[PDB]
Amino acid sequence: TLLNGVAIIVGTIIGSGIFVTPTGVLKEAGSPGLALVVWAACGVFSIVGALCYAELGTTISKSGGDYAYMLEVYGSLPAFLKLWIELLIIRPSSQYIVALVFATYLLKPLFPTCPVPEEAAKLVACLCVLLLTAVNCYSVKAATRVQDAFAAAKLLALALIILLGFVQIGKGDVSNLDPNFSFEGTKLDVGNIVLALYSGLFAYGGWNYLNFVTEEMINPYRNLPLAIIISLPIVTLVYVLTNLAYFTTLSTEQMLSSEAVAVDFGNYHLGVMSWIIPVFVGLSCFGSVNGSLFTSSRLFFVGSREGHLPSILSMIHPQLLTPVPSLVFTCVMTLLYAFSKDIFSVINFFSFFNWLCVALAIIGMIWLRHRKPELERPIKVNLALPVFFILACLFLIAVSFWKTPVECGIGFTIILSGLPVYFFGVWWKNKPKWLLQGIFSTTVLCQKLMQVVPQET
Amino acid sequence: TGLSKEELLKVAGSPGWVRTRWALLLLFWLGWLGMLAGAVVIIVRAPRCRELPAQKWWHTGALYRIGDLQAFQGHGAGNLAGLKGRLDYLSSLKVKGLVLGPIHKNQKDDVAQTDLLQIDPNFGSKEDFDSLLQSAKKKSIRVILDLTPNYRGENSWFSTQVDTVATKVKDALEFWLQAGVDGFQVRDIENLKDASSFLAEWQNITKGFSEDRLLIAGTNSSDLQQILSLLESNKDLLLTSSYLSDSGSTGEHTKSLVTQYLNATGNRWCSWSLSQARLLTSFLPAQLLRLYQLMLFTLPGTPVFSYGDEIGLDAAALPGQPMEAPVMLWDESSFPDIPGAVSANMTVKGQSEDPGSLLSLFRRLSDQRSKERSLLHGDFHAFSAGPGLFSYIRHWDQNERFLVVLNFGDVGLSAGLQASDLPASASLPAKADLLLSTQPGREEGSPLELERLKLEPHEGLLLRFPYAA
Ligand SMILES: CCCCCCCCCCCCCCCCCC(=O)OC[C@H](COP(=O)(O)O)OC(=O)CCCCCCCCCCCCCCCCC
Ligand SMILES: CCCCCCCCCCCCCCCCCC(=O)OC[C@H](COP(=O)(O)O)OC(=O)CCCCCCCCCCCCCCCCC
Ligand SMILES: *[C@@H]1O[C@H](CO)[C@@H](O[C@@H]2O[C@H](CO)[C@@H](O)[C@H](O)[C@H]2NC(C)=O)[C@H](O)[C@H]1NC(C)=O
Ligand SMILES: *[C@@H]1O[C@H](CO)[C@@H](O[C@@H]2O[C@H](CO)[C@@H](O)[C@H](O)[C@H]2NC(C)=O)[C@H](O)[C@H]1NC(C)=O
Ligand SMILES: *[C@@H]1O[C@H](CO)[C@@H](O[C@@H]2O[C@H](CO)[C@@H](O)[C@H](O)[C@H]2NC(C)=O)[C@H](O)[C@H]1NC(C)=O
Ligand SMILES: *[C@@H]1O[C@H](CO)[C@@H](O[C@@H]2O[C@H](CO)[C@@H](O)[C@H](O)[C@H]2NC(C)=O)[C@H](O)[C@H]1NC(C)=O
Ligand SMILES: N[C@@]1(C(=O)O)C[C@@H]2CC[C@H]1C2
16 A cells, blocks of 8 residues: 555655765754754755645646646746756756766775876766666666666665664764754855755755656555655655764764765775675666666657657657667766766756756646636645745745856856747748758658657557 | 658668668777776876874874863862863863873872872872763863872982882883873983883883873973984884973074974974973963964974963963962953952953964864874975075875965065975965964965065964865
8 A cells, every 4th residue: 555655755765865965964064963954954845845746746647747737837938948957957967966976986995085086087977877878778678677676775775874873872982973063153044054955955856756656556546645744754864864874983074075975984884895885875876877767768758749859859769669869868968067077066056947947836836726726636735835835945046146156147048048949949930941851851860870760659 | 740750761771771870889889998998097097095194092183281280270179070170171172182190199209108009189089080081081082191200399200219119100000001091191201210211111011001002201301312312212102302492583493403303203203392391481482472383283293282372371471470380360360369460361261252362373273283184194394495484384195285384583574485395296386375374464265376475573374275286
């Protein structure tokens, strides 16, 4: 029933954000006492958010979440606007970061105490990606089994760190660090606090673009939000107990210094230390890049059938179906983030436009309650509970103008370049007839190049 | 739809497009191995990591000589139980140890009626002493006992026969280490007959019970050859002296003191302190106290301080007081003898709030001392500079390098920093960041420029610059 329903809700989350972010929230909050409050504010803020997409997902329910709900409210250039953002800002940078953490957990155990050269942690993040689409361009029945082993190694490394952290208090020096030094301090409340939350919410990502599928398989009709309060603080509990395993065994200086917080915890406890902590976490990050390529197929089928996304995208190979021109376009836009500089410059660049698009769908959810009632909502949320989300959410956007507009500036350049190609894409008067031959010339060229046939029609 | 279809496509795509799709795919996997083996080259050409040199606890921070307990707390609470309440202050200073004592029983000047096992009941009991260790070790502040036998008279080592004096010390090492102390300190071993022999035994007793236990020895000497004779067979012995007690006040002379002390020992672990018991103010004017401090915190070794050397405790600025043991000035009610003799910028409580005060300089260095992996165990290279300058660089492998420039002269000078001998890893940039300055009146963070660098009379600088090439 729901006992098998909770476990797949936990499976979407707890990817690889937990193996990066404790050096990021500890960097921007000073104290390890205040940095644990950030992991408690994120768990609550995801309860509020995922409970609305429990509601908003079940009203409309066409296919292709966060974009059809954008379509059914806006249905114009704002729907293509969110497809333009997510294809070029959110989904590539959500995959380059997880590909980068895979590289640093191979090279940091080899050194073990030096900064890994940046020009060699990028060319392993490309081999983590360019090999992994070539699996997914081959058969999915291999590719779903490979991912099935990568939720075991993820959950085994987490449960190891808890018992390795719990015994450290019990053995000797109970509350060995016990620091709450900047509990009154290092809290600018409009600067360093919010950038602790952009990172602390990266480790909870995934509650939105995958939580639709849980409902229709168990046919609970309305029993799903009963699971979403049981499931998600249990996940928040797990993110708490690793931070206690980091804070008691390590110090507040080692966590600021290292690219890899997990291997310093791995060095303290034992001497094997090369078969355990980088292996069982190097398999965690290698599944989330793999788990982010199944979902890239499902999105282009939605966008192409409405008229956006030129039809070379979303076409399947005959033998061993695997949307080749879909998957090429994901990995090409992921590799162009190898021209970046540092991870937490990209997490602050990811999470700006992420929490913008999530706030737009819920405003669209709430303007669909002012206008157009009686659409037979099957879930009743409180009148201010999504409003309680939104004014909390729009706080994070506007305060990221006073703090670092170097990333938000150029990100508005790329979304105001999607408009230009909107008016050439779907507004366009089809008169000149060279390009309507030229599009058909290019489309048959790429189909002859990649051997792809259209969707069954 | 701009679709070219599925059944009609199979006729068009077959002819020679089988070969150029079989061969286009081969350039992928030959382009993948050119990125696989193109990333194995960079990891092999990448140099090494320098391993960490097995630091003990007395390598990672200062020490704090507490001589007279009755004058550290004051009148009324001059005891061991009153010491248990001050540890929340000492942890703010981030000292890693306390030289405590001597607290044993000395009647006066008697070999017969001086015992090293029994403490003086002016202080307390062993149950006060066992509580003191267990309370301090909760905070990771280690306790070192002072075992100088005759700590009340002229000769500290009892000018009569000497082996029974040594036999007491031979046995008290065995006893107190059972109680749980983490090291010992004897002083004034210029009044010890065959002094360099008994330490190597007492080193071996201290190493004969553990290896996180140290021994500190004091002397009044300032001669180099007298010191190195005591360090001949001994190597893991900390030796405080008066090697820097001579005034000099010229940078090229202090450079001649320190570099010769390092070159004679080679590279071993020193212990930088001006004196074995006395304060910094006893040898210095009050405008040089902010200047020896930084040097003490940057030179390779364990700095050892006496109490009140962080607040500039001078005994001569407060009459009606014992020079050997001054009165700690916590606040305005710390000197009950004369009312109104203490100003507001002369106390612990008054200097605990000013960001410019001398105690505020101490917590900024003792923070950066036991956290920067350069300053803990970095190699050391001083280099030539102007006439009144002492300049040097501390650097570990790829961590944040440092640069200290000191002005022992009363003329506003320029830098004139030319390296010309520093290695490839320690080559200097032109622009370099600032961390702090001794005299206030700088932009603490503005990246300074070394060729356009001037100094004020008696002002020192702690720059830092990251690893680059
Ligand atoms: C990078 C991945 C390559 C492998 C996959 C091939 C994909 C090819 C297309 C890539 C871009 C796909 C998104 C295009 C934006 C959406 C447009 C849309 O929705 O139209 C629907 C529209 C309808 O298609 P239908 O449904 O098939 O009729 O399709 C088109 O209009 C195709 C238009 C192609 C050109 C787009 C505009 C480009 C303007 C700037 C051109 C600059 C060229 C470079 C200049 C020289 C530089 C050196
Ligand atoms: C920094 C860049 C270096 C690394 C990336 C290099 C770029 C290579 C392409 C991007 C990533 C490729 C991933 C590998 C995919 C192959 C997986 C596989 O084995 O499938 C078998 C798949 C099916 O086998 P078949 O039975 O032989 O058809 O083989 C292919 O279809 C060929 C795949 C190779 C395509 C590489 C070049 C693509 C040409 C794009 C031309 C676009 C022009 C028009 C649009 C332009 C708009 C601006
Ligand atoms: C202790 O120091 C002595 C020399 O100063 C080292 O050799 C010992 O010498 C004494 C002579 O008084 C002998 O009784 C010991 O048996 C010697 N120790 C041996 C042979 O191990 C000695 O190496 C030092 N102790 C340690 C632990 O290094
Ligand atoms: C250490 O302090 C003493 C105390 O003044 C210095 O003087 C010695 O004093 C003792 C007796 O008090 C005499 O027997 C010595 O002859 C004195 N030394 C000299 C050189 O005359 C002693 O010099 C100081 N030690 C050093 C190395 O300077
Ligand atoms: C001080 O360090 C220098 C190396 O920088 C060495 O001094 C050499 O000593 C020998 C013998 O006295 C001379 O022939 C050389 O010319 C000296 N070289 C220099 C550069 O001064 C030596 O390692 C140290 N000095 C001593 C006395 O050990
Ligand atoms: C506390 O600070 C004040 C202000 O800096 C000091 O007052 C000056 O001290 C210097 C040297 O002691 C004198 O030359 C000046 O004449 C003093 N100025 C005034 C207006 O009195 C004061 O001395 C400091 N306290 C102590 C104990 O040094
Ligand atoms: N939502 C993520 C997952 O693990 O699925 C994706 C990115 C990396 C970690 C979190 C953000």
